[PDB]
Design an enzyme around this catalytic site. Structure first.
Site, PDB file in Angstrom:
ATOM      1  N   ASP A  17     -15.984   7.005  -9.249  1.00  0.00           N
ATOM      2  CA  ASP A  17     -16.517   5.719  -9.494  1.00  0.00           C
ATOM      3  C   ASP A  17     -17.958   5.565  -8.989  1.00  0.00           C
ATOM      4  O   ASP A  17     -18.586   4.528  -9.250  1.00  0.00           O
ATOM      5  CB  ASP A  17     -15.646   4.599  -8.909  1.00  0.00           C
ATOM      6  CG  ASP A  17     -14.218   4.604  -9.368  1.00  0.00           C
ATOM      7  OD1 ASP A  17     -13.473   3.787  -8.743  1.00  0.00           O
ATOM      8  OD2 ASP A  17     -13.841   5.332 -10.304  1.00  0.00           O
ATOM      9  N   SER A  51     -19.973  -6.388   6.806  1.00  0.00           N
ATOM     10  CA  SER A  51     -20.359  -5.153   6.151  1.00  0.00           C
ATOM     11  C   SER A  51     -19.983  -5.135   4.663  1.00  0.00           C
ATOM     12  O   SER A  51     -20.665  -4.463   3.886  1.00  0.00           O
ATOM     13  CB  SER A  51     -19.664  -3.965   6.805  1.00  0.00           C
ATOM     14  OG  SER A  51     -20.175  -3.719   8.096  1.00  0.00           O
ATOM     15  N   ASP A  65     -26.131   3.805   5.847  1.00  0.00           N
ATOM     16  CA  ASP A  65     -24.761   3.649   6.343  1.00  0.00           C
ATOM     17  C   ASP A  65     -24.260   5.005   6.860  1.00  0.00           C
ATOM     18  O   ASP A  65     -25.061   5.854   7.269  1.00  0.00           O
ATOM     19  CB  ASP A  65     -23.897   3.008   5.237  1.00  0.00           C
ATOM     20  CG  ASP A  65     -22.793   2.125   5.765  1.00  0.00           C
ATOM     21  OD1 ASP A  65     -21.865   2.719   6.406  1.00  0.00           O
ATOM     22  OD2 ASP A  65     -22.823   0.905   5.587  1.00  0.00           O
ATOM     23  N   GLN A 103      -6.650  -2.535  -8.153  1.00  0.00           N
ATOM     24  CA  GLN A 103      -7.358  -3.667  -8.738  1.00  0.00           C
ATOM     25  C   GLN A 103      -8.727  -3.139  -9.171  1.00  0.00           C
ATOM     26  O   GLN A 103      -9.528  -2.758  -8.318  1.00  0.00           O
ATOM     27  CB  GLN A 103      -7.543  -4.809  -7.759  1.00  0.00           C
ATOM     28  CG  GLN A 103      -6.266  -5.588  -7.494  1.00  0.00           C
ATOM     29  CD  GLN A 103      -5.806  -6.604  -8.493  1.00  0.00           C
ATOM     30  OE1 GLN A 103      -6.513  -7.035  -9.401  1.00  0.00           O
ATOM     31  NE2 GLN A 103      -4.548  -7.021  -8.290  1.00  0.00           N
ATOM     32  N   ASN A 129     -20.442  -9.502  13.102  1.00  0.00           N
ATOM     33  CA  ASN A 129     -19.046  -9.839  13.168  1.00  0.00           C
ATOM     34  C   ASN A 129     -18.614 -10.406  14.540  1.00  0.00           C
ATOM     35  O   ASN A 129     -17.496 -10.200  15.003  1.00  0.00           O
ATOM     36  CB  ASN A 129     -18.169  -8.645  12.833  1.00  0.00           C
ATOM     37  CG  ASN A 129     -18.595  -8.047  11.522  1.00  0.00           C
ATOM     38  OD1 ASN A 129     -18.666  -8.750  10.489  1.00  0.00           O
ATOM     39  ND2 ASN A 129     -19.049  -6.799  11.560  1.00  0.00           N
ATOM     40  N   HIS A 163     -16.800   3.875   5.738  1.00  0.00           N
ATOM     41  CA  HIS A 163     -17.563   2.622   5.689  1.00  0.00           C
ATOM     42  C   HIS A 163     -18.648   2.688   4.608  1.00  0.00           C
ATOM     43  O   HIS A 163     -18.777   1.765   3.797  1.00  0.00           O
ATOM     44  CB  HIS A 163     -18.083   2.362   7.099  1.00  0.00           C
ATOM     45  CG  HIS A 163     -18.782   1.072   7.330  1.00  0.00           C
ATOM     46  ND1 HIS A 163     -20.107   0.888   7.156  1.00  0.00           N
ATOM     47  CD2 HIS A 163     -18.290  -0.105   7.805  1.00  0.00           C
ATOM     48  CE1 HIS A 163     -20.458  -0.351   7.490  1.00  0.00           C
ATOM     49  NE2 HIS A 163     -19.364  -0.972   7.894  1.00  0.00           N
TER      50      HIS A 163
END
Ligand SMILES: [Ca+2]
Ligand SMILES: [Ca+2]
Ligand SMILES: [Ca+2]
Ligand SMILES: [Ca+2]
Ligand SMILES: [Ca+2]
Length: 310
Positions: free
Chosen positions: A43, A250, A34, A4, A169, A71
């Site tokens: 990309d 995240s 991170d 996608q 979370n 991540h």
């Protein structure tokens, strides 16, 4: 290579179900603090501008930011993937923005507060040195408020940097919001799932909640959720090439940091405070009413609402 090219969350934040490519963000730096980034990912390679490591024996370590986790690469791609130089990859919210990949988390996904603080301050110092507008994006947090990190956030804010951070979370109980998201000078981001309830997107059960006492006024105090964004089942770039689909606050965080970069690039004269106000008004105009604690108006599940492009 990409299953996608325009993931559900990108379409949702653009408020365009037929979106074919994203645009915007030129000149704005997004410092993704991170696990590092795969800076050769097709990309991302066009947007990598800084690559520094804060987890080693001296600091910063320049020209080093290797992601061994995924991540950090995933978060970066949501914020600013550009489709690649062949237009065959994925698009993030602000594909023309510059990436500052700052490794503050070990490969395990956990990091030390001094390292995080150092990177926050360094991003601010680099904004000042370069004369360029910078957004710090932190898809990380803890239940405890660490004073090294809090002071660093204040320092960065004072230097004109915008700070965006995950809510956490640990939801859905009241009062589960973590830090740095819960700081007054950080924009705490709640996670939406691609489910409608009460006529709106639904906050995911995992997303950490703020506090009743200070929700409802459309003014951010410590402990308040601010902006909701797509966080569940998010397709993005991965560290050893390719892509992956993962969930969390995240993943929500870089949707907001990317939106902020898109907006800021359209008017880089905005102060960080004025940019934050723009975002807050966008959010207020899209009231989230789904998920535990979500309500009409500003609430402790979803904050002001869902900021979108239009
Ligand atoms: Ca730049
Ligand atoms: Ca260290
Ligand atoms: Ca906050
Ligand atoms: Ca409030
Ligand atoms: Ca609401």
């Amino acid at each position: 290579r990409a299953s996608q090219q325009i993931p559900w969350g990108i379409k949702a934040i653009y408020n365009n179900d037929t979106l074919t490519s994203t645009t915007g963000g030129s000149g704005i730096n997004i410092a993704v603090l991170d696990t590092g980034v795969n800076t050769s990912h097709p990309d991302l390679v066009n947007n990598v501008e800084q690559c520094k490591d804060f987890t080693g024996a001296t600091t910063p370590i320049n020209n080093s930011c290797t992601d061994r986790n995924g991540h950090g690469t995933h978060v970066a791609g949501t914020a600013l993937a550009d489709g690649g130089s062949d237009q065959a990859g994925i698009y993030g919210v602000a594909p023309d923005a510059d990436l500052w990949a700052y490794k503050v988390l070990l490969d395990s996904g956990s990091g030390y507060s001094d390292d995080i603080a150092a990177a926050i301050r360094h991003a601010a110092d680099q904004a000042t040195a370069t004369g360029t507008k910078t957004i710090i994006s932190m898809s990380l947090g803890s239940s405890a408020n660490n004073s090294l990190i809090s002071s660093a956030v204040n320092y960065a804010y004072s230097k004109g940097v915008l700070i965006v951070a995950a809510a956490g979370n640990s939801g859905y109980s009241q009062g589960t919001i973590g830090y740095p998201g819960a700081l007054p000078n950080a924009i705490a981001v709640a996670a939406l799932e691609n489910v409608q309830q009460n006529g709106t997107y639904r906050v995911a059960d995992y997303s950490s909640r703020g506090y009743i006492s200070t929700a409802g006024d459309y003014v951010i105090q410590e402990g308040d959720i601010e902006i909701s964004a797509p966080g569940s089942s998010v397709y993005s770039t991965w560290y050893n090439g390719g892509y992956n689909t993962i969930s969390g606050t995240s993943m929500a965080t870089p949707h907001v940091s990317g939106l902020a970069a898109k907006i800021w690039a359209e008017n880089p004269s905005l102060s960080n405070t004025q940019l934050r106000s723009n975002l807050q008004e966008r959010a207020k105009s899209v009231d989230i009413k789904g998920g535990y604690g979500a309500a009409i108006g500003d609430d402790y599940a979803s904050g002001f609402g869902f900021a979108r492009v239009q």
